[PDB]
């Protein structure tokens, strides 16, 4: 064997920052073995690169933000989700502004741009982090857990007290060795309540938000004319966000993630607690893909 992968070709995209409302030009570039995912702010002289690693995560309530000095990259979770879902080890991500473009609110556009360019196997073993021990963090009624598991699996439960959610599935569990990230998860869009959006605009947040890139919910119903892509899109989006945050570990996981009302802050607590507890994980490679607990789509 299981080899590292980068992109076969450069991918360019244009979009708006969900939070900033800024137009942003995005370029995904191939990268050498053991680069990881590195974000670059090309609008600054000199360019600032922030490796997409747990240690570089800014103190952030809405999205996952990387920081170095007073430079930031906002809303990395959907793109990193896309890269995690296709098993991209190495890539440079160029941005003309502080925020990754939101596209349609899901990882769908990213997965497509990436799979249009195609992938490149590289002459070097893919390193994996295998969960050896259970690791859990709680705070109030939120819980985030890692469980040893021979594969990669994400379960999540949310519980909003809202007519839309109450009469919709708020639990989901997806084993990615037997279920398509691409088909079952990647198209799941971010969501916001009409009441919060009014306030957030007031504070110059959500300035790029529209029905074009978010599920907009009022008191009772989804306002998006065309409705939901999945009956359980909300909890599916939460799994997509978690897979993005998990990728800040800097290697693909062999294990299970369970989220109970968890978010970016607790996800990040769990990553830090996992990194710090070296008894709970090991790094492993696989000389024989045929026998390994995880598999990849052809390049
Ligand atoms: C309910 C909240 C607290 C919650 O727990 N969330 C969990 C999920 N998190 C996410 O998806 C994270 C956070 C986002 O960054 C992207 N990945 C969604 C939701 C969230 O954080 N959503 C922020 C938000 C999204 C869209 C809009 C929008 C607009 C629009 C308009 C114009 C017509 C009026 C506003 C806010
Ligand atoms: Zn999200």
From Swiss-Prot:
UniProt entry tagged with the keyword Zinc: yes
Reactions catalysed, as given in the entry: a UDP-3-O-[(3R)-3-hydroxyacyl]-N-acetyl-alpha-D-glucosamine + H2O = a UDP-3-O-[(3R)-3-hydroxyacyl]-alpha-D-glucosamine + acetate
GO cellular component, one term: membrane
Alphabetical list of SUPFAM superfamilies matching this protein: Ribosomal protein S5 domain 2-like (SSF54211)
Entry function: Catalyzes the hydrolysis of UDP-3-O-myristoyl-N-acetylglucosamine to form UDP-3-O-myristoylglucosamine and acetate, the committed step in lipid A biosynthesis.
PANTHER family linked to this entry: UDP-3-O-ACYL-N-ACETYLGLUCOSAMINE DEACETYLASE 1, MITOCHONDRIAL-RELATED
Protein name per Swiss-Prot or TrEMBL: UDP-3-O-acyl-N-acetylglucosamine deacetylase
Taxonomic lineage from the root: Bacteria, Pseudomonadati, Pseudomonadota, Gammaproteobacteria, Pseudomonadales
Gene: lpxC
């Amino acid at each position: 064997m299981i080899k590292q992968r980068t992109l076969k070709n450069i991918i360019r995209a244009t979009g708006v920052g969900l939070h900033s409302g800024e137009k942003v030009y995005l370029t995904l570039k191939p990268a050498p073995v053991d680069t990881g995912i590195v974000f670059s702010r090309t609008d600054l002289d000199p360019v600032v690169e922030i490796p997409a690693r747990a240690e570089n995560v800014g103190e952030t309530t809405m999205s996952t933000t990387l920081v170095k000095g007073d430079v930031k990259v906002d809303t990395v979770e959907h793109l990193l989700s896309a890269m995690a879902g296709l098993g991209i080890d190495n890539a440079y991500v160029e941005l003309s502004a502080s925020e990754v473009p939101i596209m349609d609110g899901s990882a769908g556009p990213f997965v497509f741009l990436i799979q249009s360019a195609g992938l490149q196997e590289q002459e070097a073993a893919k390193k994996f982090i295998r969960i050896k021990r259970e690791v859990s963090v709680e705070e109030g009624d939120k819980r985030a857990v890692f469980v040893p598991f021979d594969g990669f699996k994400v379960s999540f439960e949310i519980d909003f007290d809202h007519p839309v959610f109450r009469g919709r599935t708020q639990q989901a569990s997806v084993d990615f060795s037997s279920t398509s990230f691409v088909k079952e998860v990647s198209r799941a869009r971010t969501f916001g309540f009409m009441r919060d959006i009014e306030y957030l605009r007031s504070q110059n947040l959500a300035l790029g938000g529209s029905v074009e890139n978010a599920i907009v919910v009022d008191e009772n119903r989804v306002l998006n004319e065309d409705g939901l892509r999945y009956e359980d899109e909300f909890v599916k989006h939460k799994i997509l966000d978690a897979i993005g945050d998990l990728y800040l570990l800097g290697n693909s996981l062999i294990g299970e993630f369970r989220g109970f009302k968890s978010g970016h802050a607790l996800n990040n607590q769990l990553l830090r607690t996992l990194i710090a507890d070296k008894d709970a994980w090991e790094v492993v490679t696989f000389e024989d893909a045929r026998t390994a607990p995880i598999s990849y789509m052809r390049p």
